[PDB]
Design a binder for this molecule. Sequence first.
Ligand SMILES: CN1C(=N)N[C@](CCC2CCCCC2)(C[C@H]2CCC[C@@H](NC3CCCC3)C2)C1=O
Length: 387
Amino acid sequence: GSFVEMVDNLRGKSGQGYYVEMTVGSPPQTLNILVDTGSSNFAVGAAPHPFLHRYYQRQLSSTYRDLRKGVYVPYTQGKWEGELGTDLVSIPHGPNVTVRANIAAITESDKFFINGSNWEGILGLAYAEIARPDDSLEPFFDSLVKQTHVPNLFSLQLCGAGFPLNQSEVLASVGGSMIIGGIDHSLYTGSLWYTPIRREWYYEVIIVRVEINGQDLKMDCKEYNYDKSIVDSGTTNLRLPKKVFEAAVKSIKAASSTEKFPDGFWLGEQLVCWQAGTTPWNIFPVISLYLMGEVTNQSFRITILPQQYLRPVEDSQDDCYKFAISQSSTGTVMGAVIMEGFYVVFDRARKRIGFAVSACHVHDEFRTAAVEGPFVTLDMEDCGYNI
Ligand SMILES: CN1C(=N)N[C@](CCC2CCCCC2)(C[C@H]2CCC[C@@H](NC3CCCC3)C2)C1=O
């Protein structure tokens, strides 16, 4: 329906993350927390760090409970270490409830905090299977559902501005919505289409076909999900398995061949700039990902524009971007730049993820993002990778 209290409760951007305000402890300690659908721990800065202007102070909370256990979490881009405990947690622009949740108090980290991101912790919204140190550490959303009458579903509208936001602008700007326990109809246009959650660990999905400007990439669909495909708000880019990335970049280069870009642009390292207002969107192709539907032999597609996969960056008055599609050795990752095109419903109760065109997606007068279906698609279970 309508969830006014939660609409516009996010801030941030694809490159540094989208975050929501939360409170921890008694009296409440306010912290900004990264919304991360790609992990399952609630972990917050709990000791001084050069990039933090506030942190969780356990000694000032009367409701803090020490679990007397450490946690070490190495990830490819960095690491975080901490001390486990529980405390009372609330979301001010959320459901009007307080829950007792697990909190990892971060004591040491490497490439975790981002200078100028304005967040002090992460909210891992995925399932207990990938919680650290193990699946006995109940994730936040599981605690929320178990302790309250909040429905077992949340939905995300991540709003890319379509241009760079300076330090002051990114702090003052509305970055989107996290609707806890429901679907807000004002955040999308058209219909919601659902794909099954293949397995409850990451938010795993199955891609069954890929097109670049309607041209089929024509790879064995297992390649698209090798070794998994996930929906992850805590990754910036659309990341594709090595072989898929090579074929997709070849096709995107061919479609955009009226302009030549340096190798560093395609590697997602170097920015490209155009005179103010002259970005040649029309030379870049749309990308369609077909996802398994809820009905046997049925799929649907989500279509993104270059306004999603070209990420705005500051250089001058030029309009500059980085290519936000990159290679992966751990499967497809539908990151924040893809999520910015859509309202995404994480329907845990019905083991499915919904997509609809976002009411805040960036587009031009000639093209828009799309969510369309149905399409007849056979042997879709064969697209899933095993082992
Ligand atoms: C890709 N990915 C995530 N989605 N979460 C983590 C942990 C994954 C866990 C590791 C343990 C196993 C299960 C998966 C850490 C998180 C830390 C803070 C920074 C953030 N990325 C920034 C924020 C926005 C863009 C880039 C990454 C990660 O590596």
